[PDB]
Amino acid sequence: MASMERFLSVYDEVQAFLLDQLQSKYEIDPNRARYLRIMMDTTCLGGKYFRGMTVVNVAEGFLAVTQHDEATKERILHDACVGGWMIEFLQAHYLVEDDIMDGSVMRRGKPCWYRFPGVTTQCAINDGIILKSWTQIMAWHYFADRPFLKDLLCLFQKVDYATAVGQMYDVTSMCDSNKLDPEVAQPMTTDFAEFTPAIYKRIVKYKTTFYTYLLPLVMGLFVSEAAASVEMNLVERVAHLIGEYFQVQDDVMDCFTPPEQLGKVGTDIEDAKCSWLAVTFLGKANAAQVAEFKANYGDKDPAKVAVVKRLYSEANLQADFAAYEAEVVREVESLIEQLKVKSPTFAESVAVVWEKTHKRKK
Amino acid sequence: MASMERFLSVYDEVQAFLLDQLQSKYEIDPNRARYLRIMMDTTCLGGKYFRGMTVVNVAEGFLAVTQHDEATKERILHDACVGGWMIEFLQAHYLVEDDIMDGSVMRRGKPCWYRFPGVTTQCAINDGIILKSWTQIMAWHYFADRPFLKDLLCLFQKVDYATAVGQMYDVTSMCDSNKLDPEVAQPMTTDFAEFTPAIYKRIVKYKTTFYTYLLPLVMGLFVSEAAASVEMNLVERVAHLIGEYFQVQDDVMDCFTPPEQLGKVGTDIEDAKCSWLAVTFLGKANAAQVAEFKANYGDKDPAKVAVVKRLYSEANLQADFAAYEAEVVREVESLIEQLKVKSPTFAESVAVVWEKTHKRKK
Numbered sequence: 001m002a003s004m005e006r007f008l009s010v011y012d013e014v015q016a017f018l019l020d021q022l023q024s025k026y027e028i029d030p031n032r033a034r035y036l037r038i039m040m041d042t043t044c045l046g047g048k049y050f051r052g053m054t055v056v057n058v059a060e061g062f063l064a065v066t067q068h069d070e071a072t073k074e075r076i077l078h079d080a081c082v083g084g085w086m087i088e089f090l091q092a093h094y095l096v097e098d099d100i101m102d103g104s105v106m107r108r109g110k111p112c113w114y115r116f117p118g119v120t121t122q123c124a125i126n127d128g129i130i131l132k133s134w135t136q137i138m139a140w141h142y143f144a145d146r147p148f149l150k151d152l153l154c155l156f157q158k159v160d161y162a163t164a165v166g167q168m169y170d171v172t173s174m175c176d177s178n179k180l181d182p183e184v185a186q187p188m189t190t191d192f193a194e195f196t197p198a199i200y201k202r203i204v205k206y207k208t209t210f211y212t213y214l215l216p217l218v219m220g221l222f223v224s225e226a227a228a229s230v231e232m233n234l235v236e237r238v239a240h241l242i243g244e245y246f247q248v249q250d251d252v253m254d255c256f257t258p259p260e261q262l263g264k265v266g267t268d269i270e271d272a273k274c275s276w277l278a279v280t281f282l283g284k285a286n287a288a289q290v291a292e293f294k295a296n297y298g299d300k301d302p303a304k305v306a307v308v309k310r311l312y313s314e315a316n317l318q319a320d321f322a323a324y325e326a327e328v329v330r331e332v333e334s335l336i337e338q339l340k341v342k343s344p345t346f347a348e349s350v351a352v353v354w355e356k357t358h359k360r361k362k
Numbered sequence: 363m364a365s366m367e368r369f370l371s372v373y374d375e376v377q378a379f380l381l382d383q384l385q386s387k388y389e390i391d392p393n394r395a396r397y398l399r400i401m402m403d404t405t406c407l408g409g410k411y412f413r414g415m416t417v418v419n420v421a422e423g424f425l426a427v428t429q430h431d432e433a434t435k436e437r438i439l440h441d442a443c444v445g446g447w448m449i450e451f452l453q454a455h456y457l458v459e460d461d462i463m464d465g466s467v468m469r470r471g472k473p474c475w476y477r478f479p480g481v482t483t484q485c486a487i488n489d490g491i492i493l494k495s496w497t498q499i500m501a502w503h504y505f506a507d508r509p510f511l512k513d514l515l516c517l518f519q520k521v522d523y524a525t526a527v528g529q530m531y532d533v534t535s536m537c538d539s540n541k542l543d544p545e546v547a548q549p550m551t552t553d554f555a556e557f558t559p560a561i562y563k564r565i566v567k568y569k570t571t572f573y574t575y576l577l578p579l580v581m582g583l584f585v586s587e588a589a590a591s592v593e594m595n596l597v598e599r600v601a602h603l604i605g606e607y608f609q610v611q612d613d614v615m616d617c618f619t620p621p622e623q624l625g626k627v628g629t630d631i632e633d634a635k636c637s638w639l640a641v642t643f644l645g646k647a648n649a650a651q652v653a654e655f656k657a658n659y660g661d662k663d664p665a666k667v668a669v670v671k672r673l674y675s676e677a678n679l680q681a682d683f684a685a686y687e688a689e690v691v692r693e694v695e696s697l698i699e700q701l702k703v704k705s706p707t708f709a710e711s712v713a714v715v716w717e718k719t720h721k722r723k724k
């Protein structure tokens with residue numbers, strides 16, 4: 001709570017930097033400054049700050065065991081905060097744009113940015129472009145003479161790219177691969193042959209895990225100058241594991257958590273998404289269940305949607321989930337043990353990240 | 363012609379690199395590779411390559427007067443080509459996204475990408491995100507151990523940001539500033555008070571000049587290691603001047619060039635754009651002309667649009683244009699003369715850039 005207020009005081013400094021630079025260098029007028037301040041506030045705040053706060057917890061962990069001057073402590077914490085906000089702004093970018101592509105209605109308990117009456121798709125698209133440019137403006141401003149600058153940019157960009165590739169895997173997950181063709185309007189799949197665990201796994205590996213887990217963790221290492229002190233293949237394997245589970249939870253909540261609690265309203269059934277629920281159901285259903293799933297999936301019709309939920313409850317998926325969670329707890333503990341060998345501190349940081357995720361309710 | 367085929371052979375190498383990396387590192391399947399190849403071809407090719415080819419002409423100019431080994435010549439030309447393609451891919455990004463926000467129908471003689479039947483806004487938004495990520499993937503791949511890497515990235519990013527800020531100035535140019543408010547649906551301006559030369563100038567400075575002129579020119583200097591050899595304040599002043607004129611031509615052509623020749627269809631009148639034509643007309647019109655302009659501007663109605671064109675032809679704007687062109691020829695020559703002092707070669711490169719622009723018909 002106190003630490004989160006400190007993370008937010010760094011948001012305020014960053015907002016101030018960005019907005020004063022708009023006035024001093026980009027000829028902005030007060031009203032457009034205001035619009036951009038409100039956009040930044042609306043798209044970047046109100047979340048859990050899980051990605052940002054991870055950078056900071058990684059850095060705090062190394063600080064407890066590493067000798068530094070006070071001044072250097074303070075710089076390290078401040079950089080971890082800036083780094084954290086780069087990742088939040090990056091997420092803010094993805095969500096503004098994602099909400100347009102998913103035809104979404106609510107986000108963090110409010111309308112999606114593009115649905116604000118004075119915004120619309122026309123302004124929102126470019127607003128999301130601005131959120132991303134801001135990540136880079138921050139990096140070059142606050143990290144210009146840090147040793148980790150080049151490594152951080154290069155990583156940030158590879159993570160952004162994988163994420164965008166992931167979003168392509170996601171937005172085309174309901175069409176048949178052999179039919180993808182810019183020239184031909186795309187029909188929803190009728191056989192659901194590509195609703196498989198491996199295909200699902202590729203969607204999720206790219207669209208969520210790099211930017212939600214790999215980036216904040218390695219970012220925490222960069223600003224700590226601690227990345228040579230870990231086994232990177234382990235960091236990857238653990239980001240990919242927890243990241244996958246994180247997205248599985250997102251999928252279950254889309255169907256089962258009231259929006260009242262969730263803060264977004266779920267579109268996966270209507271959007272015909274290759275979600276965990278749809279893949280898992282099709283891996284256990286009998287012939288008649290499959291036939292009725294195929295009869296109602298991917299239509300915006302309330303009673304079709306309700307038939308899918310019923311088939312999901314009947315297949316007892318909220319116990320396939322428990323079985324999957326159980327295999328994940330196993331594998332995460334095992335990876336944490338393997339990380340303990342070169343860095344107890346980073347292993348603990350990961351234990352904390354796993355814990356925050358496992359207990360997640362939104 | 364031969365040189366342009368050589369620029370295009372570097373596009374093919376780049377396309378091949380990017381697409382093989384998708385297969386070897388991002389788990390892509392052949393059909394999505396194909397979709398991305400067609401997207402890249404459709405959004406990046408078919409233009410004039412003016413921005414890309416400028417990087418290359420800048421570099422060629424320095425090569426004629428600078429001693430190098432043959433191998434070093436060849437590397438320099440190849441880097442200028444890669445650099446050029448970074449700028450084309452960047453433009454490709456902006457146009458895909460711009461066409462969505464302007465509700466545009468045609469581009470480079472074909473439907474806008476988002477209008478392809480098998481694309482739609484849903485895929486196009488993210489496709490445009492990919493085009494931009496590719497610029498960075500290229501830079502880090504082909505320029506990893508070049509001395510100019512850091513300078514180039516930093517410049518590229520500041521230019522991208524200014525451009526995005528410019529696009530915000532553009533997409534809000536028809537509303538009153540004091541009324542911009544995310545919460546309130548935005549009405550078109552009724553007084554046209556902000557349709558002024560200074561306001562127009564700010565739109566254009568940001569949205570076109572950085573990325574169309576400043577970037578390719580300084581890029582040509584980076585890959586040549588020649589940037590200390592110029593007066594950068596002059597490079598800026600000349601990019602901003604020719605860039606402004608470039609956009610003025612774009613505005614006139616939107617109204618007056620048949621789409622048959624233009625390769626896009628014009629939306630400025632219907633979109634209520636603060637174009638050069640609308641600003642210039644309002645700077646010379648009598649009270650009754652202003653009243654009738656305000657009666658018909660910014661409606662998608664064919665006969666309202668036709669009344670604006672008629673008022674434009676009656677105000678003899680295609681002679682305000684000639685007067686403006688004449689002041690621009692003056693000022694460009696003067697800047698070229700001033701550049702002659704430290705680099706005849708770069709001055710000549712600019713003379714060529716001015717020439718290609720001045721003679722432009724699309």
Ligand SMILES: O=P(O)(O)C(O)(C[n+]1cccc(-c2ccccc2)c1)P(=O)(O)O
Nearest residue numbers: 094095097098102163164167207208250
């Ligand atoms: O739409 P998704 O996939 O279920 C959600 O989790 C968005 N998300 C997660 C990861 C990545 C991205 C993403 C990445 C790039 C571009 C757009 C979105 C979106 P949502 O439930 O909050 O809508």
Ligand SMILES: O=P(O)(O)C(O)(C[n+]1cccc(-c2ccccc2)c1)P(=O)(O)O
Nearest residue numbers: 456457459460464525526529569570612
């Ligand atoms: O729409 P404009 O402004 O008239 C055009 O020239 C696009 N353009 C030029 C410069 C910058 C950008 C731009 C920059 C950032 C984001 C979107 C577009 C667009 P068009 O006539 O080809 O449509």
Ligand SMILES: C=C(C)CCOP(=O)(O)OP(=O)(O)O
Nearest residue numbers: 047048049208212247250362
């Ligand atoms: C599933 C993913 C990757 C998108 C949502 O991430 P969060 O659920 O962390 O959203 P916010 O906390 O930022 O609101």
Ligand SMILES: C=C(C)CCOP(=O)(O)OP(=O)(O)O
Nearest residue numbers: 409410411570574609612724
């Ligand atoms: C006016 C601007 C800045 C956008 C169009 O640029 P071009 O007219 O050069 O478009 P292409 O050559 O790339 O088609």
Ligand SMILES: [Mg+2]
Nearest residue numbers: 098099102104
């Ligand atoms: Mg979504």
Ligand SMILES: [Mg+2]
Nearest residue numbers: 098101102170
């Ligand atoms: Mg999505």
Ligand SMILES: [Mg+2]
Nearest residue numbers: 250251254268
């Ligand atoms: Mg979701």
Ligand SMILES: [Mg+2]
Nearest residue numbers: 460461464466
């Ligand atoms: Mg346009």
Ligand SMILES: [Mg+2]
Nearest residue numbers: 460463464532
């Ligand atoms: Mg535009």
Ligand SMILES: [Mg+2]
Nearest residue numbers: 612613616630
């Ligand atoms: Mg135009």
